[PDB]
């Protein structure tokens, strides 16, 4: 396993991305690369500095560290398998979770433990499943993640707005004065040690939004071990339309969605506990027992959405 030496890693709420020279763009000079490879893989920008490398681990003396999948699961039904003193964790987490903390230490991520398959969220452990079947060194863990249609999440967000505009507010006037379908991204080109990356702002942890707790409509997290499901990990998945970016509100008050909102499959490594995640149907092992699309499809979809939005945002 090797570490990264000259890449800007995701920290201080900033995300980076490599670009390549694209001469069709006049205002901007560069466009996003496909990847250092064809298929989806381990996102090197949002890793911990101590997270070494489809294979990831930390040395045997390092605390919990995590990596996220590149593809952002917004809605629908996605299935995959993760191939497995050294502990690990498998789960899913939003962007607000820290790469330094084990998935499930905050309220933005939900995960499962390697030993005893316990479910971890808000830093608390759960034993919802009664099967209690131990996991060995060569097991393949499937994940079926079902999320509501975009329209229902949008209407749930609109309900949140209609509450917030006056029900939760009764500089108030400015707050009351403050696009759901439309994506607006923020990207700046930077050069770090002769290398070229894009800088984008990220989201911060805030108070949990309440009203009944916010839940994605008919959202479900299902886990399988060698074809056998072990239950639903969670139902009341948090909406995210709920996700305030880091914002210097003081600045704009004094003067007076980025297409990446969703849950990412996240892999955590502790004291050398390695694993790998599977993305593509050819190396998918239980794709038919559901009856559907693999993660790689959504990878290509995200590539297309990014390049098309890059096209339109030039003018």
């Amino acid at each position: 396993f090797v570490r990264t030496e000259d890449i800007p890693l995701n920290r201080r709420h900033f995300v980076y991305r490599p670009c390549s020279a694209n001469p069709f763009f006049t205002i901007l000079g560069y466009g996003c690369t496909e990847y250092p490879f064809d298929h989806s893989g381990m996102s090197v920008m949002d890793r911990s500095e101590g997270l070494s490398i489809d294979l990831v681990s930390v040395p045997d003396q390092y605390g919990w560290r995590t990596a996220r999948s590149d593809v952002c699961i917004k809605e629908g039904m996605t299935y995959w398998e993760v191939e497995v003193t050294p502990h690990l964790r498998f789960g899913v987490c939003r962007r607000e979770a820290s790469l330094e903390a084990p998935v499930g230490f905050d309220v933005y991520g939900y995960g499962i433990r390697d030993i005893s398959l316990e479910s971890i969220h808000e830093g608390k452990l759960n034993c919802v499943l009664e099967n209690g079947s131990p996991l060995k060194e060569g097991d393949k863990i499937g994940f079926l993640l079902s999320l509501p249609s975009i329209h229902t999440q949008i209407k749930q967000a609109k309900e949140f707005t209609k509450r917030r505009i006056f029900a939760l507010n009764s500089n108030k006037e400015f707050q009351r004065a403050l696009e759901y379908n439309d994506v607006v991204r923020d990207q700046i080109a930077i050069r770090y040690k002769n290398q070229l990356f894009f800088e984008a702002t990220d989201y911060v942890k805030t108070t949990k939004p309440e009203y009944d707790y916010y839940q994605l409509e008919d959202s479900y997290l299902a886990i399988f071990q060698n074809g056998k499901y072990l239950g639903k990990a969670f139902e009341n998945l948090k909406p995210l339309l709920f996700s305030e970016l880091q914002y210097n509100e003081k600045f704009y008050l004094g003067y007076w969605n980025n297409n990446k909102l969703g849950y990412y499959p996240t892999i955590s490594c502790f004291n050398g506990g390695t694993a790998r995640i599977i993305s593509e149907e050819d190396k998918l092992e239980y794709l038919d027992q559901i009856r559907v699309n693999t993660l790689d499809t959504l990878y290509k979809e995200q590539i297309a959405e990014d390049i098309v939005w890059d096209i339109i945002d030039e003018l």
């Binding site: 694209n22 069709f24 466009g31 390049i307 098309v308 096209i311 339109i312 030039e314 003018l315």
Partner: peptide, 29 residues
């Protein structure tokens, strides 16, 4: 970038129902 980027840029520069873009998209090909 090789395939569709210049046709898209020219079409958005042209932009009137979406039918006008659908046709300009065909006429460019």
């Amino acid at each position: 970038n090789t395939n569709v980027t210049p046709h898209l840029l020219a079409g958005m520069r042209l932009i009137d129902p979406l039918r006008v873009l659908g046709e300009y998209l065909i006429e460019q090909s």
